[PDB]
């Protein structure tokens, strides 16, 4: 019964429309869902706009009139120019007439703001089509009718606001370059009269709703109008005084003044300088006398969240930071302006105490701008000494755990503030430290925040001052730990102590006995069962090692051996209570130290000693698991093997090229283990089905394979001796992984194989052309068949596949030349398949492979393979690129699509293609590819976009080919085409814009 209005053969039952509309908005459940699908289908009727004049006049439901205006909107923005002329004037007076009638009824003007604004926006859509060439009197008649009624005058301000937004703020994406410029010039040519009406309304009062709507429109004007309208009138005086006093206009006025602080002004006229000082002084005066004084607790006000206080305090922070970042120099030399400057910054100090992350980041950016300036600019820092002193406390007390982006911003400002006055910084930190000891501010959060602050300023004090400060801080922190009783308290203070010492490597490097005591204490902490202590000891250990590795590899005075040997000797006792991943961090830390030893024989010996425990567990398992492979059924053995390999990964991660001797100790047996594990996975899938790949047993087995591939990848990506890579590593690796991958069922193939192969081709691809061919044969076709049925299945195989093809196309393009022609055709199909992905990883690589492939073909010169390539695939690449450019579903790759398209078109207009892109019969002989390219493109676009005129297609292509050596202009022409295909009747002259 609800689906009657979808029948347009009858007359539209308006009362039945409101029933469907009301059931949608105020209804619920199944009836609302049904009315929803009906209204969507009604509005999407290409003839629904015909019945818009009836709904808009005889309906009593504003939501129905709103829906009618949406139907009109789609008609005006997409098919306006297709209508017969009488329909267009008939829509225009209908909209103009309704808006006048809605403004005259004060009840409707008060009660239907949504419908009126929807009508105004619909009017603006008409103006964008008809004004001013078919409506030169709009602005004059608007100014005329404004003085008649306050209501229509207020609404005229809404129309002008929306017009300014459509022309200047949102035109870039939505209209052609020519159409945008035409409207901007049209608004610019008549702004004098518009500003006159706006300034008169502002100065004469007195209706708040009219004043606010006028200020709302002024906010939009300031994005683009010349500065003379602001500085050569009295409007700054009205904004900074009159309109700041009343709260109704205060919010919008503050936003206007923020934009005024960004006007393009001349920097050499002293009168403009005085006007810029003056409106800031008035604005700060009005805030001090009408809103709150400089001493007010803004943190408490913001937290109370009364009315619009939060919006106001946000807007005040934006106004102050914006103005002072540009103009604070205007206040720093004149003695009479000193109080204004400091009161402004004192408001910012108070704003900076508000508990609001995003607001704090806004003020923190300004402080960064300030203290960086005081750090370099002469004679400036003394002005702000009291401001900066309060800032130090604000930042220390709001230090965050090292968003890490917010910590880095806080650290940067605090480092500057420490340089500007080292003495004040230390005093504040020690004072806060005492308030932690006397209990007045003691808290888990508060002691962590302070330690992070104390740790952030490392490297800014002198070494002597830093030495005394560190000692003082550790002393107080130590006494704070002894004072506390209970595990939990003693754990938090102990971690902060370890955090601080890890942040001061310069102190550790010069005090060995202290450094050694710290490390030994960390080792001791690795046996603590309390939650988080072990992670803390490991994280601190490797953090100290990264910064102080040299002091672990030398033989320190008072010592008999490098401390690295002492760590290695006791490594089983030290890590016996650690989780596996914590053990790997430890081994990685030792690998950092060992790489500092540049005596090869000593480094290899240290490497052998460090790997003693995993090597012996390895040698044992390889002996037992080979006789016979039933122990690998035991999940305990599978876990032990993975941990051994992961340990090798951890050490290889930090040692890189130095890891090679340890890799050679296990390499052959590891690849043998890889084969044995691969057989059991295959046997398990055969005996239990694909579900076996989800079982813990098989997931454990595949973990071994993945860690083996990660280990080989990690070394090869860092190896310095590529000859050994090619002649010792690569051959056994390919035999181990290629055939196993190809001959497993899809669900059992490890995407890590593709990743590992990508690294192999990256490092040594130029040295193994037969190996690259072997990689392609084993993974190309079978992986492509996994990923060419949808965009969903096998996401990792998908990403690694195109990373692998990309590097092969970069480093060993000869491998594709050897492909059988049917296989090379799949390669092209795979590339275009990557175009159509919304997945950013696949899409970027697909476009890059396409570009690099075209370049590879170009470098071959006039050669049968190059010519056959253009014969078979040039127009495939042109048309497939045009498809993703124009389908509105791949906008994220516009720039790369444009570059690839520009390169394709440039080949033809540079005569880089020697062969004919056409058949010998299809086009007369002697025809250039340039002439044939224009024909093919014209016919392609004519069938793909039949609503375009032949003149449009010809002008677009003429401009496009003409501009194929200018990427920015080329892209602009593509954007103009993307706009014109969304409508009917686009102006073909638009493409002459450049």
């Amino acid at each position: 019964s609800m689906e009657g209005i979808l029948d347009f053969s009858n007359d539209l039952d308006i009362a039945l429309l409101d029933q469907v509309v009301s059931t949608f908005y105020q209804g619920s459940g199944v009836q609302q869902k049904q009315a929803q699908e009906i209204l969507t289908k009604f509005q999407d009727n290409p003839d629904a706009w015909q019945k818009a004049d009836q709904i808009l006049q005889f309906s009593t439901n504003p939501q129905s009139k709103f829906i009618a205006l949406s139907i009109l909107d789609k008609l005006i923005t997409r098919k306006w120019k297709l209508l017969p002329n009488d329909h267009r004037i008939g829509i225009r007076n209908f909209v103009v007439g309704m808006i006048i009638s809605m403004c005259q009824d004060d009840e409707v003007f008060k009660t239907q703001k949504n419908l009126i604004n929807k009508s105004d926006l619909t009017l603006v859509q008409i103006l964008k089509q008809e004004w001013p060439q078919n409506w030169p009197e709009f602005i004059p008649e608007l100014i005329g009718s404004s003085s008649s009624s306050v209501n229509v005058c207020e609404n005229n301000m809404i129309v002008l606001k929306l017009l300014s937004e459509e022309v200047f703020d949102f035109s870039a994406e939505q209209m052609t370059q020519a159409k945008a410029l035409h409207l901007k010039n049209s608004m610019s040519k008549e702004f004098e009269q518009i500003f006159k009406l706006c300034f008169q309304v502002l100065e004469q009062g007195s209706s708040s709703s009219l004043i606010v709507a006028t200020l709302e429109s002024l906010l939009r004007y300031l994005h683009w109008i010349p500065y003379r309208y602001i500085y050569e009138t009295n409007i700054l005086e009205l904004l900074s005084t009159k309109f700041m006093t009343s709260p109704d206009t205060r919010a919008i006025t503050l936003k206007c003044l923020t934009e005024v602080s960004n006007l393009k002004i001349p920097q050499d006229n002293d009168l403009i300088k005085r006007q810029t000082v003056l409106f800031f002084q008035n604005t700060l005066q009005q805030i001090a006398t009408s809103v709150m004084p400089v001493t007010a607790d803004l943190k408490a006000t913001y937290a109370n969240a009364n009315g619009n206080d939060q919006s106001f305090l946000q807007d005040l922070a934006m106004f102050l930071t914006t103005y002072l970042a540009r103009n604070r120099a205007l206040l720093e030399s004149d003695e009479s302006l000193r109080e204004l400057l400091l009161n402004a910054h004192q408001y910012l100090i108070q704003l900076s105490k508000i508990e609001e992350r995003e607001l704090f980041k806004t003020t923190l950016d300004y402080w960064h701008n300030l203290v960086a300036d005081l750090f370099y600019e002469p004679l400036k820092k003394h002005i702000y000494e009291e401001i900066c002193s309060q800032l130090r406390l604000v930042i220390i007390e709001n230090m965050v755990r090292p968003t890490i982006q917010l910590y880095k911003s806080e650290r940067e400002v605090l480092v500057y503030l420490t340089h500007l006055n080292v003495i004040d910084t230390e005093e504040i930190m020690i004072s806060k430290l005492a308030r932690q000891i006397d209990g007045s501010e003691w808290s888990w959060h508060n002691i962590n925040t302070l330690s992070w602050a104390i740790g952030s300023i490392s490297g800014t004090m002198s070494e002597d001052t830093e030495k005394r400060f560190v000692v003082t801080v550790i002393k107080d922190l130590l006494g704070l730990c002894e004072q506390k009783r209970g595990k939990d308290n003693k754990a938090v203070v102990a971690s902060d102590i370890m955090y601080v010492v890890g942040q001061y490597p310069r102190f550790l490097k010069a005090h060995w006995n202290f450094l050694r005591t710290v490390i030994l204490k960390l080792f001791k902490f690795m046996h603590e069962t309390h939650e988080g202590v072990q992670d803390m000891a490991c994280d601190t250990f490797i953090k100290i090692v990264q910064k102080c590795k040299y002091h672990f590899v030398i033989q320190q005075p008072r010592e008999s051996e490098p401390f690295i040997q002492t760590i290695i000797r006791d490594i089983q006792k030290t890590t016996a209570d650690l989780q596996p991943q914590q053990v790997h961090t430890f081994y990685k830390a030792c690998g950092i130290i060992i790489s500092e030893e540049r005596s090869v024989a000593e480094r290899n010996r240290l490497l052998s000693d460090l790997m003693q425990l995993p090597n012996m567990a390895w040698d044992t398992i390889v002996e037992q698991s080979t006789a016979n492979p039933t122990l690998l059924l035991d999940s305990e053995t599978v876990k032990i093997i993975a941990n051994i390999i992961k340990t090798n990964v951890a050490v290889c991660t930090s040692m890189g090229a130095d890891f090679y001797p340890q890799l050679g100790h296990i390499y052959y047996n590891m690849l043998q283990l890889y084969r044995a594990v691969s057989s059991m996975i295959s046997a398990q899938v055969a005996a239990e089905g694909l579900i076996a790949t989800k079982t813990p047993k098989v997931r454990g087995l595949r973990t071994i394979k993945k860690e083996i591939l990660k280990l080989v990848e990690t070394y090869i990506s860092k190896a310095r001796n590529l000859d050994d890579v090619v002649k010792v590593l690569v051959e056994p690796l390919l035999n181990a992984v290629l055939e196993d991958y190809m001959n497993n069922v899809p669900d059992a193939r490890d995407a890590e194989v593709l990743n590992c192969m990508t690294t192999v081709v990256e490092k040594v691809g130029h040295m193994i052309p037969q190996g690259v061919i072997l990689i392609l044969q084993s993974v190309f076709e079978c992986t492509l068949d996994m990923i060419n049925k949808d965009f969903t299945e096998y996401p990792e195989h998908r990403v690694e596949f195109y990373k692998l093809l990309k590097v092969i196309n970069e480093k060993s393009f000869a491998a594709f030349l050897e492909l059988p022609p049917a296989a090379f055709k799949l390669f092209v199909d795979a590339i275009c398949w990557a175009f159509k992905h919304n997945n950013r990883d696949v899409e970027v690589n697909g476009l890059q492979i396409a570009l690099d492939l075209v370049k590879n073909i170009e470098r071959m010169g006039n050669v049968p393979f190059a010519n056959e390539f253009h014969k078979n695939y040039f127009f495939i690449f042109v048309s497939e690129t045009f498809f993703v450019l124009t389908d509105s579903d791949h906008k994220s790759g516009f720039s790369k699509q444009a570059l690839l398209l520009m390169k394709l078109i440039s080949l033809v207009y540079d005569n880089k293609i020697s062969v004919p892109l056409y058949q010998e019969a299809e086009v007369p002989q002697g025809t250039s590819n340039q002439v044939y390219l224009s024909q093919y493109l014209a016919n392609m676009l004519s069938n793909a976009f039949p609503h375009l005129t032949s003149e449009q297609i010809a002008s677009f292509l003429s401009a496009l080919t003409k501009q194929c050596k200018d990427l920015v202009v080329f892209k602009g022409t593509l954007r103009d085409f993307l706009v014109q295909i969304k409508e009917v009747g686009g102006d073909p002259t638009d493409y002459l814009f450049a």
Partner: peptide, 11 residues
């Protein structure tokens, strides 16, 4: 400096 070590170990 050397007075810290004993308390550091005794944590």
């Amino acid at each position: 400096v050397e007075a810290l070590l004993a308390r550091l170990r005794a944590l």
